């Protein structure tokens, strides 16, 4: 037996149920405190401990914020490893799909405010989440929103000294994946996360992912039927991409028009329009979005506890 002061055995927790990629809900055996246990998958891993897990851990250990999921500790098994997180009862997908659930404008304001605040926080810390979707947005029993699942997140940098960034391009789920990525961009930044937020905002009313593509080409056509067509006029330098016309695009902004039915409030629609902006550099950022008159109107943001 070897000494192990700083990695407790997961036996301190009692496994209750697969809520998830193996995710278990569990209960601390002494305090009753609820947690989520995420086991580290070693399917093959012919290179010791998975570098991606090292990465995710480094990032979770960095990010400590009210609207970001909280890694409590790492547990061993005596061999496997489990990431232990503060437990969250609900997740946005489960709520947006359950018809027995209804948001007022005020609580929706509240949701979007916590979400944009989480993004602002992770970006201020030089992290890209890269997996924006409703199912990665958690909500605790007391109505606090938390961003989860950083297994696809990545640190970024101030890419100067004339050497553009070479980040991975096949990142973020298709329905939430921003235009930049679909054209093969590798020098992208925080705006990719902001784009998905757009899709989710609309999802608060459509109760369903606004843009569901078969393939990437289907995603781009579908995206175009809402946001207009790509053009060096709308998006200066768009030309620069090797897949511009080489991808059989359609020359052809019904964005505010197609959603008027679901989302009633003008400011909300304006904000969604400023999130779902084609040119990433012209796309609203988390700071200005939090500032949008949408959060500063009569139906002010309200807690969710109630519901």
């Amino acid at each position: 037996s070897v000494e192990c002061p700083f990695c407790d055995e997961v036996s301190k927790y009692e496994k209750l149920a697969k809520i998830g990629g193996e995710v278990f809900k569990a209960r601390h055996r002494k305090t009753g405190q609820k947690v989520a246990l995420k086991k580290v998958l070693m399917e093959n891993e012919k290179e010791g401990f998975p570098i991606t897990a090292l990465r995710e851990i480094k990032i979770l250990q960095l990010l400590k914020h009210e609207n970001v999921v909280n890694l409590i500790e790492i547990c061993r098994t005596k061999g496997s490893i489990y990431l232990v997180f503060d437990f969250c009862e609900h997740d946005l997908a489960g709520l947006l799909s359950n018809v027995l659930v209804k948001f007022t404008l005020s609580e929706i304001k509240r949701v979007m405010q916590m979400l944009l605040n989480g993004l602002y926080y992770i970006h201020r810390n030089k992290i890209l989440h890269r997996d924006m979707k409703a199912a990665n947005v958690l909500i605790t029993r007391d109505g606090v929103l938390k961003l989860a699942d950083f297994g696809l997140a990545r640190a970024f940098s101030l890419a100067k000294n004339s050497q553009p960034n070479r980040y991975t391009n096949r990142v973020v789920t298709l329905w939430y994946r921003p235009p930049e990525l679909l054209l093969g961009e590798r020098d992208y930044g925080p705006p990719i996360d902001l784009w998905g937020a757009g899709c989710i905002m609309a999802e608060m009313w459509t109760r369903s992912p606004i843009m569901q593509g078969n393939t990437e080409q289907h995603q781009l056509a579908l995206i175009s039927q809402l946001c207009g067509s790509i053009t060096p006029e709308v998006w200066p330098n768009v030309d620069n991409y090797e897949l511009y016309e080489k991808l059989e695009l359609v020359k052809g902004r019904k964005v505010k028009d197609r959603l008027k039915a679901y989302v009633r409030d003008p400011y909300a629609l304006d904000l969604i329009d400023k999130l779902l902006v084609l040119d990433p550099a012209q796309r609203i950022d988390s700071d200005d979005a939090l500032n949008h008159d949408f959060f500063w109107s009569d139906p002010m943001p309200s807690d969710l506890k109630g519901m």
Binding site: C4, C7, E73, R76
Partner: protein
Amino acid sequence: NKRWYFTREQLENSPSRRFGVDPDKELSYRQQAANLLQDMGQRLNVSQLTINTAIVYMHRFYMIQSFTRFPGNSVAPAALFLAAKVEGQPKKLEHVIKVAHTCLHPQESLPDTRSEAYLQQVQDLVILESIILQTLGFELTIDHPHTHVVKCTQLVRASKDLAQTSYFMATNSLHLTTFSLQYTPPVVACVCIHLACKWSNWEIPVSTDGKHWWEYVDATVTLELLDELTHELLQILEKTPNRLKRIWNWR
């Protein structure tokens, strides 16, 4: 935040001491692990930062475990494999194992990469990496004095020379001492700049106020401490053959 910092008394009663290893012997075991890490690290073509990270992993690992139980020659390669993954310069498992083998046994020749023996040492490495991760409680993000050196040198408008010598002091401070287990990286960085100034016969002008330069780097630092730690570091440097030669002005 004070989990991996120790008092001199904590350093005296290390796990290795408790198994009959002299202070001096244990210190020697540490210097040898750092030497092996540097050799392997150079051959694998990782950065000094990665070697350094692996060295801190090692230093901390031996505040929890005993050398009588875990030999430097086993822990070093795993620590380096891990540090290379963590610092974004991943080296293949077989690769680190091959280089480890040539460093430890220059005259032997690699086993059949098909043998039960080789398969077992690959599995031993993976196992040791898991043990290291668990001893460190998966706390893998390490801060080095070098970061603070860069910043501070500029903050005294030092010659390129002086800056080069300061980084050299920092790296040797990792190989030769347990400063990383006792003092924060910014403090160590002050120690290194201080020794570098004395060694280069450089003098940092008293600030316009009457505030010393180091006061802009870490508030807890005092001249008494600086002189004590530079004397300690300098003493071990004098015991290391050819080491000072590298920074000795030969003109």
